[PDB]
Symmetry: D2
């Protein structure tokens, strides 16, 4: 599993459950081509987005649909989504975890990159 996303809720002190995540890859014409999508589980994790064969070098965008998450809890948040844009696999295959912590008017994101 070369690309995983884990999301926490800073208001309730819990995993962020059932947040939609869309991954895009920049094409030659510089548009964002849809690459993979899914929803976080009860543990706040999203596994199984892609495979090592499919996850080639490129510039990827991970979009976390935070507005839908807050609106479904009856909260009006500030951001449309949380986005993370990065070059991947440019020195060979790596494994990426995108971690995020969400508040209605704020988010933090970090990356854990292994072997």
């Amino acid at each position: 599993c070369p690309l995983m996303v884990k999301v926490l809720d800073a208001v309730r002190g819990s995993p962020t459950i059932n947040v939609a995540v869309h991954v895009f890859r920049k094409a030659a014409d510089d548009t964002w081509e849809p690459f993979a999508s899914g929803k976080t589980s009860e543990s706040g994790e999203l596994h199984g987005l892609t495979t090592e064969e499919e996850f080639v070098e490129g510039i990827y965008k991970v979009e976390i649909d935070t507005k839908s998450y807050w609106k479904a809890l009856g909260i009006s948040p500030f951001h449309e989504h949380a986005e993370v844009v990065f070059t991947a696999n440019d020195s060979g295959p790596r494994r990426y975890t995108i971690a995020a912590l969400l508040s209605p008017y704020s988010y933090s994101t970090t990356a854990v990159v292994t072997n």
Copy 2:
């Protein structure tokens, strides 16, 4: 000054100086149209981006050129840039500060929305 950006460096504990910031507005066709841009000052702030008359309700994207900032420091960064996408509304408190705290593999951002 309805929209301001402030950027901090979590590695050096300093304002983020001379970093390019681009603001875009989402058009009817759903593309991002350039709206305003600048470079942060010695205090890490970018003022005077827009005016009240120009800053109408809609969806805006603030892009911070973090990759060039880290590279100028000889530091290898993770992100291509930091992006903040939000709706401006008139029922809200008028003045928007977008704040960001930068590390090579992480960033945090918050909005401070205040005042009459």
Copy 3:
């Protein structure tokens, strides 16, 4: 003004107003001695805590009374308070801003150390 504190609310997107902040200095016996205190202003800032003559090198603790802030908003918080413990040195850039961003179950803090 060698030491300043600024506090932001990540739930409401606003400065954290009227929150108690206590500063302590570590004594020779290793206890924490009261040093300075105040409440944040309408802009979430606390200025005038100390002076250059009083703010000597040593270990300091800044305690932000976050629990009372959230309770006043009717919100159940996790932390008893937020604490920031650091050494002040004279080889460093003189002015210290302690910044904190608050959520009910989380806080982030950074230091901005600048200027002659």
Copy 4:
């Protein structure tokens, strides 16, 4: 495992390995009594600090020795440590994960509290 600590490094994009963690519990005289301690593993996690029987109600302080971590990597950081102080188990036993993200001049911490 009712109390766990997980720490990430925002500079290197990796788990924070071998950071010391000390837990204290406030005594009746309001002093901080040592309660448990350990070091994070290669995954950045610290398990096995306490048991459900020992982890009674009280005010606990989790101190993450971030200065020793940065100094061992040849970096001079700002903070002495990162501290998290909270009341635990006041509505019955819960499981607590204290998560932290570290930079030389900054840290963030969040809590995940379950059942």
